[PDB]
A paper describes a structure:
Equine rhinitis A virus (ERAV) shares physicochemical properties such as buoyant density, base composition and acid lability with foot-and-mouth-disease virus (FMDV).
Since the pH of crystallization liquor for this structure was 4.6 (tests confirmed that the virus solution did not significantly perturb this) we might have expected to see dissociated pentamers rather then intact particles. In contrast the low pH ERAV structure shows weakened interactions at the pentamer interface, with no ordered electron density for the VP2 N-terminal hairpin, which is partly replaced by the N-terminus of VP1 from an adjacent pentamer which contributes a few stabilizing interactions, consistent with a particle en-route to dissociation.
Numbering used by the authors:
A (entry chain 2): 31 to 230
B (entry chain 3), F (entry chain 3): 1 to 226
C (entry chain 4), G (entry chain 4), H (entry chain 4), I (entry chain 4), J (entry chain 4): 16 to 36
D (entry chain 1), E (entry chain 1): 1 to 246
Write the structure that this text describes.
């Protein structure tokens, strides 16, 4: 099922740039596939894989990466599908949310990492656009998020509006092996501004 | 021509929440258009359209094992000051107000494996001498039978039953407007599994939402922490 | 929300507050 | 399954009749809650002389065990206007002050801030000097006397002056190209401006700053932190109250 | 040549999409900017007795490092009305003054000015004398007491009284037939009139004159002088501000 | 009959910019008709309809000589606090305000003799690690080729590119709303002349105007000189 | 420019300001 | 009963008192 | 006789004075 | 001549001044 975070994406150009805006078509900002990590039996509720979008993986976003890299500002949404590979004998559940302006990260800024959420946060993470990933019912979460930020566009080098939080609510039990967490990310309605110099 | 005016005794006082504005000293500022998604205008809407997980012994769920029966697996007294409602959005939003009205919606999500099954009996017990200790006792009350393996999730509404139109958010030693009873969950059957060595227990996540008739009134200032 | 005097508009809407575009 | 009541079948739930409205959710309204004076901050007056620093009006990242602190932390982006009440409470003998003028200057988001005494008033030998930026001019200067004052205060409304269309209460990124631990949840200008309280009192007392947020708009709800500790399992918190069993 | 974008041909420029309005240029409006109180001048009170001189209200040729000073020097001819705020700040012990009446007299452009104490008030032996031109009459006299006063001020509006249809802020010629270095950028009556502050305080304190210029009209723009020094080549000036990296 | 009135606490205070007038004491003065040409009502109009010359090393122009190439001839960071914008009308008008929005229009006027010719490449470089040092580097950016001898004057618009709706007039250590990048001018070719002994160098005057979308808000008081 | 009270005309236009011919 | 000023409604009926449902 | 303000009826006729039957 | 407030008639014309016959 598709969950729209706050609203559907738009292709409107930034109100605050009087310079040419380049609309990256789908064949240019393609789609990228990552393995987020492995969910083990030892990890406990509250543990979360924090995936700011993108910033530590921008370098692995091929085409999109090349274009973004050469320009100063970017406005764009994302289409993400988080999956899990578990058997029908595995028990457990995650909550995967899309958080605007997520922060905690002890300035390991814009790096995909793992942390232990503080209770009132894991209890209430459902207050942000999300989907539960119960191991007895489903294996995927699909979230589509619009561009969001204090201004009409940003510099992805200094700001990551959206960050995906995959959080353990019910620990993994059942067969001894781990459950790999997987994620596909596709930039959506990307618009780019002001070309930067040649890299000499 | 000068107008005869009489100065009220409460004259030069402060009164913090006067329904009126101060004099403006920096006019004519047109503010930039703020598009931005997800604006909310009333906290009760986000409380109703959203769920939080309870705090059962510090975890967001209770467990059923292959050894269970009788005793209650989950028990919480119906009061926003209850412990298991601690980390929730609805409980936390409530501390800003003195009184509440309406129902709470609880939904249990069984996260035990697909090879696992169990049945629960969830009861709403009204104020009484002392809370039932076994399910045969509680089953005389309002209750529902949840057979997992029919639906993995189950919603139960704790009703509002009181002679008062609103009850207190901040509870204390039991009064007639403090507590509304108890919510309990029992195991109708213990957890069964395809192999007890692989799956011996299953966890039921419990989440709360404000009911459709839920409301909060009287904003209040925060007292000393406790 | 919380302005209930008939005199809340003693100063014009553009002087008293900001104006959205 | 089966849905409504009294057969006791699996999945079946009993009938509930929802309650009628009464209060109309008026009190949980975002802008209603914020349009009132809140005692946020308390601050010291600067002497008329010297090179004082301005105090920035930023009630956003607070930890204060007060209702405005958590409430302002319930959303990701915020927009509202502002009203202030500045009061002045003696911390010495009220007879120390025979005149006690207090100059208040408010600065819009982005205003230059270096001041040094520069405006001289002369009278019968002795003279008085006030700051370059305390003088009445382009931005609002308010002058109130504390001495016989029946309220030793002042108050006025000011608008949203930031350059951002919305103030980010939380920001996952840096407000400056140099990524210093400092500029982290930052973003320049995410506030209401700054004030400068200046007076021959300065010792003798302090202020009391209250903010009122008319026209508040909140965006993207966030988790609300607890306020009290967790009581024991299966119990209830018990607080002193109006109601309580005598 | 070629005009718009991306072929890189000689004379060709790339596309620019102009920004939408927002603020509407309201703040750069001449009369809006001038209709506010400005702390221009500070002045001494004259004793009730003697032959005092009147102070001319001429804010035009200023060098003051203040926003009204440069701004008034941005046009060649000016017209506006006037509002005043006169305050009084002690420079001694506030208990020196037990009554402290202050007589203010405003004079239109062209008014005669010689005064000497001439109006006697009598009471129980002792008597009090005030100036010939301080008495209430043809032109406005304002009388305020400084003693218990909650604001030790007064204020009123006055119109443009000059005989010139417009005040020349700059004048390439002489205001008198005798061409004395003195009457050079001159022209008689290029001002708002004059005031006379008179009081038994006089020592004990001074005033604070603020001008407000409602209905301002400016003619023929002129160059605007810098305000700050020139930074080094290819650099930027860096000023303390609200924003600034913490 | 006397009206019940309550005195607000901010009662006898001053507040300099109140949106209201004082009481008039010298009524009925009819003012003479003021014909007089050239009245202006808004400073932004004179800023847009007028140009000033920049201050490049204290002169209103940069030079090209018969020996040039690579290096930038003119470089200024896009901020109203920039040095080369120093003596200008737009920069000076700006000091009265806290924030600005919009573009700046620069026009270069080649004043080298008619027997002289050269070509320039003018680029707008967005915020970056460090500013290009040669033209082959900058030419990847927004740029225009100005061949003198086609038009002796050339207008270039420095755009507004920022996530914020307004930027700061008063700059400081680089922030996200302080600086918008750099404007550079390179010599695509060195000055050629009919006789290098007679004309060895030519000067390009550089003037600035407020762009069509330029605006200024928030009047501010002057701080200590620096 | 900068007069936003409903009471700005408490005194007639000819008493409050000057009048152009 | 006992409110006889023309100014008794200086504040709106919903601000001044409670409202019955 | 002797009440000439426009504000003489700031309070209703039944609050300000007595009423004849 | 010299009365320019809207409130100059706060008191009726017969209370404020004399009346010509």
């Amino acid at each position: 099922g598709t969950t729209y975070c706050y609203s559907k994406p738009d292709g409107r150009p930034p109100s605050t740039v009087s310079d040419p805006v380049t609309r990256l078509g789908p064949t240019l900002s393609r789609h990228y596939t990552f393995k987020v990590g492995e969910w083990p039996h030892s990890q406990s509720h509250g543990h979360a894989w924090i995936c700011p979008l993108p910033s530590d993986k921008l370098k692995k976003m091929g085409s999109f990466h090349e274009v973004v890299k050469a320009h100063h500002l970017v406005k764009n949404g994302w289409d993400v599908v988080v999956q899990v590979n578990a058997s029908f004998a595995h028990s457990g559940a995650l909550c995967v949310a899309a958080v605007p302006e997520y922060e905690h990260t002890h300035e390991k800024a814009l790096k995909w990492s793992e942390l232990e959420e503080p209770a009132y946060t894991y209890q209430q993470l459902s207050v942000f656009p999300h989907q539960l990933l119960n191991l007895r019912t489903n294996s995927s979460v699909h979230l589509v998020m619009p561009y969001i930020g204090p201004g009409p566009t940003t510099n992805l080098t200094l700001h990551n509006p959206w960050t995906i939080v995959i959080l353990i609510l019910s620990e993994l039990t059942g067969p001894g092996q781990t459950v790999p967490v997987t994620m596909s990310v596709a930039p959506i309605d990307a618009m780019v501004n002001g070309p930067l110099p040649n890299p000499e | 021509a000068p107008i005869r005016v009489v100065s009220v005794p409460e004259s030069d006082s402060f009164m913090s929440s006067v329904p009126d504005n101060s004099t403006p000293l920096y006019p004519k500022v047109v503010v930039p258009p703020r598009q931005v998604p997800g604006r909310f205008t009333n906290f009760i809407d986000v409380a109703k359209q959203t769920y939080s997980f309870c705090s059962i012994s510090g975890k967001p769920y209770f467990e059923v094992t292959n050894t269970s029966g009788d005793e209650p697996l989950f028990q919480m007294d119906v009061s926003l000051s209850a412990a298991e409602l601690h980390g929730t959005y609805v409980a936390s939003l409530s501390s800003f107000f003195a009184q509440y009205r309406g129902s709470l919606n609880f939904n249990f999500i069984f996260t035990g494996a697909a090879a696992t099954k169990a049945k629960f009996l969830v009861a709403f017990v009204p104020p009484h001498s002392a809370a039932p200790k076994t399910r045969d006792e509680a089953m005389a009350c309002i209750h529902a039978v949840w057979d997992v393996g029919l639906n993995s999730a189950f919603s139960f509404n704790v009703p509002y039953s009181s002679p008062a139109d609103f009850m207190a958010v901040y509870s204390a030693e039991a009064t007639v407007v403090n507590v509304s009873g108890w919510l309990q969950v029992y195991a109708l059957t213990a957890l069964t599994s395809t192999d007890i060595a692989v799956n011996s227990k299953g966890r039921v996540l419990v989440a709360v939402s404000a009911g459709p008739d839920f409301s909060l009134r009287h904003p209040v200032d925060l007292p000393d922490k406790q | 929300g919380n302005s209930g005097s008939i005199v809340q508009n003693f100063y014009m809407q553009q002087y008293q507050n900001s104006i959205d575009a | 399954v089966t849905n409504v009541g009294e057969d006791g079948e699996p999945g079946e739930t009993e009938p509930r009749h929802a309650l009628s409205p009464v209060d109309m959710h008026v009190h949980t309204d975002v802008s209603f809650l914020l349009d009132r004076f809140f005692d946020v901050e308390t601050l010291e007056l600067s002497n008329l002389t010297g090179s004082p620093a301005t105090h920035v009006l930023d009630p956003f990242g607070s930890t204060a065990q007060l209702a405005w602190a958590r409430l302002l932390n319930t959303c990701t982006y915020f927009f509202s206007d502002l009203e202030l009440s500045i009061q002045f409470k003696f911390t010495t003998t009220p007879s120390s002050v025979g005149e006690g003028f207090v100059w208040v200057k408010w600065f819009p988001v982005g205003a230059p801030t270096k001041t040094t005494d520069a405006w001289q008033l002369e009278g019968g030998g002795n003279s008085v000097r006030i700051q370059q930026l305390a003088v009445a001019g382009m931005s609002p200067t308010v002058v109130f006397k504390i001495a016989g004052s029946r309220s030793q205060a002042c108050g006025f409304s000011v608008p949203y002056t930031s350059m951002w269309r919305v103030v980010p209460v939380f920001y996952n990124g840096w407000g400056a190209p140099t990524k210093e631990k400092a500029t982290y949840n930052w973003l320049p200008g995410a506030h209401f401006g700054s004030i400068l309280l200046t007076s021959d009192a300065h010792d003798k007392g302090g202020c009391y700053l209250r903010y009122r947020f008319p026209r508040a708009n909140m965006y993207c709800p966030r988790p609300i932190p607890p306020a009290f500790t967790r009581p024991a399992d299966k119990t209830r918190h018990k607080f002193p109250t109006n109601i309580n069993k005598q």
